[PDB]
C-alpha cells in the first residue's frame, strides 16, 4: 500500500556527489595516521593517573583535528552548503563536528572486539585508550552502544553519506541565522534518503529504517552534550592545550 516513487535525476546526482565527496575525504587505509604524534599507552588498570599523564591525548587530539579538517572538506561538497552565509557555515560545522566524527568513525569500528581498527596494532582504539585521554565512562559506554547500534543497521554507503550530510545541515542548531535555508537544504537531503530506502533497501518489509536513523541523530545530540561537559573538565588540567590542536581548541573551547 506504500507508494515507491523513483529517485529523481537530481536525487541520483545528489547521491553521486556525496559518495564522491566521501571518497575524497575518507581514507579507508588510514595511511596518514603515522604522521600524528605517536600513541602512548601507559598502564592505568585510575582517574588521577589518567589526568596526570593524558598519554593518549596528543594522538587522539591529532586524530580528531585531522577528522575535523576532512568534515569541513566534506561539508563544502554538500549540495546547498555553498549557498549559505559563511557565518552559518561555521556555526553548523562547529556544533556538528564531534557528531559527524562519531558518525564517520563507524567505518573503522568493528564488532570483532568492539574497537576502532584503523590498522594495524598501534592504531587500534579501545575503551581504555579513550579513558587514557581524560574521558569518563559516562561518554565512552553510550558511544560504543551508539557505534554497535549503528553497525547493526547495515547502512548502505549511500545512506551513510546522506546521514552525515543531514547531520551537518540542521536548522535547529544554536546560533543559526537563516534556518529556513538550512531547513530547505536538509529537506532536500532527507527526501533523497527517504526515497532511497523505499527504492533501494531490501526487502523492504520494514522501511522503519529511516525512523531508526533519525533516532541515531538524537543519540548524537546527547553524546555531543556529554562530550561538551567532559571537554570543559579536561581543559581544567594544566598544560592540556599543549596536547590538543588550535583547531580542536577553537571547535570545542
Ligand X SMILES: C[C@@H]1[C@H](O)C=C(C#CC2=CCC[C@@]3(C)[C@@H]2CC[C@@H]3[C@H](C)CCCC(C)(C)O)C[C@H]1O
Quick check: 60 binds ligand X (CB under 6 A)?
yes
CB of 253 to ligand X, least distance (A): 10
Stretch that binds ligand X, among 84-92, 101-109, 149-157, 179-187 (CB under 6 A): 101-109
Quick check: 167 binds ligand X (CB under 6 A)?
no
Spatial neighbors of 89 by CB under 8 A, at least 6 apart, are 75, 81
Quick check: 61 binds ligand X (CB under 6 A)?
yes
Other beta carbons within 10 angstroms of residue 201's beta carbon come to 17
Quick check: 130 binds ligand X (CB under 6 A)?
yes
Quick check: 55 binds ligand X (CB under 6 A)?
no
Quick check: 227 binds ligand X (CB under 6 A)?
yes
Stretch that binds ligand X, among 96-104, 178-186, 192-200, 210-218 (CB under 6 A): 96-104
Quick check: 146 binds ligand X (CB under 6 A)?
no
- How distant, in Å, are the alpha carbons of 16, 120, 128, 142, 252 from that of 95? 26, 32, 26, 19, 9
Quick check: 226 binds ligand X (CB under 6 A)?
no
Quick check: 160 binds ligand X (CB under 6 A)?
no
Q: Give the residue ranges of the annotated binding site for calcitriol.
A: 26, 67, 104, 108, 135, 227
Interface ranges with ligand X (CB under 6 A): 60-61, 63-64, 67, 101-102, 104-105, 107-108, 116, 118, 125, 130, 133, 139, 143, 227, 231, 248
Q: Give the residue ranges of the annotated binding site.
A: 26, 67, 104, 108, 135, 227
Amino acid at each position: 500500500d506504500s507508494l515507491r516513487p523513483k529517485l529523481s535525476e537530481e536525487q541520483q546526482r545528489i547521491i553521486a556527489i556525496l559518495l564522491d565527496a566521501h571518497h575524497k575525504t575518507y581514507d579507508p587505509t588510514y595511511s596518514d595516521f603515522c604522521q600524528f604524534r605517536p600513541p602512548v599507552r601507559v598502564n592505568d588498570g585510575s582517574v588521577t593517573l589518567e589526568l596526570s599523564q593524558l598519554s593518549m591525548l596528543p594522538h587522539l587530539a591529532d586524530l580528531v583535528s585531522y577528522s575535523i579538517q576532512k568534515v569541513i572538506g566534506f561539508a563544502k561538497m554538500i549540495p546547498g552548503f555553498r549557498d549559505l552565509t559563511s557565518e552559518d557555515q561555521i556555526v553548523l560545522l562547529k556544533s556538528s563536528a564531534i557528531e559527524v566524527i562519531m558518525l564517520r568513525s563507524n567505518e573503522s569500528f568493528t564488532m570483532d572486539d568492539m574497537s576502532w581498527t584503523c590498522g594495524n596494532q598501534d592504531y587500534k582504539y579501545r575503551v581504555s585508550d579513550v579513558t587514557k585521554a581524560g574521558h569518563s565512562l559516562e561518554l565512552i559506554e553510550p558511544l560504543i552502544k551508539f557505534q554497535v547500534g549503528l553497525k547493526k543497521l547495515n547502512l548502505h554507503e549511500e545512506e551513510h553519506v546522506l546521514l552525515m550530510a543531514i547531520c551537518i545541515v540542521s536548522p535547529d542548531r544554536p546560533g543559526v541565522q537563516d534556518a529556513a535555508l538550512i531547513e530547505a537544504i536538509q529537506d532536500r537531503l532527507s527526501n533523497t534518503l527517504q526515497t532511497y530506502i523505499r527504492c533501494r533497501h531490501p526487502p523492504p518489509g520494514s522501511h522503519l529504517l529511516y525512523a531508526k536513523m533519525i533516532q541515531k541523530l538524537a543519540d548524537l545530540r546527547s553524546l555531543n552534550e556529554e562530550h561538551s561537559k567532559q571537554y570543559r573538565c579536561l581543559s581544567f588540567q594544566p598544560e592540556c592545550s599543549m596536547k590538543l590542536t588550535p583547531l580542536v581548541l577553537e571547535v570545542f573551547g
